Amino acid sequence: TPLVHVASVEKGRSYEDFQKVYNAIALKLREDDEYDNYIGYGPVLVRLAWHTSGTWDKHDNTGGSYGGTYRFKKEFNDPSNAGLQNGFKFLEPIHKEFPWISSGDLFSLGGVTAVQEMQGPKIPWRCGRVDTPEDTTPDNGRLPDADKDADYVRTFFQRLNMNDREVVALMGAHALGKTHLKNSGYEGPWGAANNVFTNEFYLNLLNEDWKLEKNDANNEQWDSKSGYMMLPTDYSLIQDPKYLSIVKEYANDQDKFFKDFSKAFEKLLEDGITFPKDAPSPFIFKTLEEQGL
Numbered sequence: 001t002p003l004v005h006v007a008s009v010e011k012g013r014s015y016e017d018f019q020k021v022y023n024a025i026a027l028k029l030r031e032d033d034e035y036d037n038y039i040g041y042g043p044v045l046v047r048l049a050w051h052t053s054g055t056w057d058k059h060d061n062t063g064g065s066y067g068g069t070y071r072f073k074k075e076f077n078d079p080s081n082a083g084l085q086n087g088f089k090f091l092e093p094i095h096k097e098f099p100w101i102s103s104g105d106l107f108s109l110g111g112v113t114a115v116q117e118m119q120g121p122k123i124p125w126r127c128g129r130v131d132t133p134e135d136t137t138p139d140n141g142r143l144p145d146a147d148k149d150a151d152y153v154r155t156f157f158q159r160l161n162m163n164d165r166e167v168v169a170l171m172g173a174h175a176l177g178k179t180h181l182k183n184s185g186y187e188g189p190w191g192a193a194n195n196v197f198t199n200e201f202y203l204n205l206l207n208e209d210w211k212l213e214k215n216d217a218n219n220e221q222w223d224s225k226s227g228y229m230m231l232p233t234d235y236s237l238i239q240d241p242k243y244l245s246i247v248k249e250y251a252n253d254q255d256k257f258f259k260d261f262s263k264a265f266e267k268l269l270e271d272g273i274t275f276p277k278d279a280p281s282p283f284i285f286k287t288l289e290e291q292g293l
């Protein structure tokens with residue numbers, strides 16, 4: 001008995017309602033740009049979207065973005081989530097202004113907004129995630145380890161029903177933001193353009209000269225002359241033949257990367273949710289820049 005989480009739109013709420021919430025996060029993203037030495041809050045908002053979705057198990061429909069269990073001490077306090085309470089705190093003023101949206105709709109819309117606002121692809125979003133009880137919070141250990149190889153990555157992602165293409169498109173988001181040693185014991189950005197979404201991660205992986213070096217938290221990571229770093233799991237995408245081909249693909253076609261990332265990131269944030277046929281079509285939100293805001 002895998003669980004059935006069916007979507008329930010928040011009462012009366014339509015598109016205008018969720019576009020208002022998107023503009024609140026976008027306007028706050030402009031205003032609070034100082035964060036993490038001017039990278040701003042976009043990156044960690046994408047990593048919260050991903051970490052609140054990525055607990056899912058396709059075998060039993062436990063985990064995932066449906067029930068917003070990240071708000072419970074257990075998951076909140078997971079070591080793999082070291083750092084995301086910056087993102088949770090960012091979102092708090094917004095949930096108080098719109099007390100009506102559910103936690104998983106807010107945690108997943110937060111990440112859509114961050115990608116779009118950083119000039120990433122339009123990501124279609126569907127509402128209806130419903131907050132479930134403290135007891136439904138999955139246990140710690142479901143999120144990936146950064147110290148492992150291509151085989152680890154493939155097998156890990158099979159649990160969320162992610163194929164290689166989907167994994168490499170998903171990993172392109174590591175063009176964003178940075179690893180911070182106090183959080184994960186890894187230190188460095190992956191590139192120059194930390195807070196605008198591009199295929200820079202692929203170009204860097206193929207063209208930078210990486211060196212395997214150990215960091216002050218005594219973990220190995222791959223380092224470039226230009227001040228960039230790759231995690232062992234990041235680097236494995238060029239070590240494996242099946243992944244290297246798709247990295248070389250996104251490296252040479254920015255629009256293919258945009259398109260696949262949008263599909264794969266929409267799927268990761270929808271895993272586990274049944275949508276009724278009567279449920280509305282996905283929303284596509286205008287950015288502030290398309291709204292002349």
Ligand code: HEM
Pocket residue numbers: 043044046047050082083144145146153170171173174176177178179180181183184185186231233265
């Ligand atoms: C093999 C799988 C993956 C591993 C092991 C992994 C691991 C990590 C690690 C170690 C960090 C640094 C966190 C910190 O020190 O603050 C990080 C950051 C980040 N990851 Fe992942 N990640 C993986 C896949 C993904 C995917 C699929 C996405 C989303 C589409 C994602 C998005 C991000 C983002 C946006 C950050 C930036 C955080 C910030 O600057 O605040 N990661 N990840």
Ligand SMILES: [O]
Pocket residue numbers: 047050
């Ligand atoms: O991540």
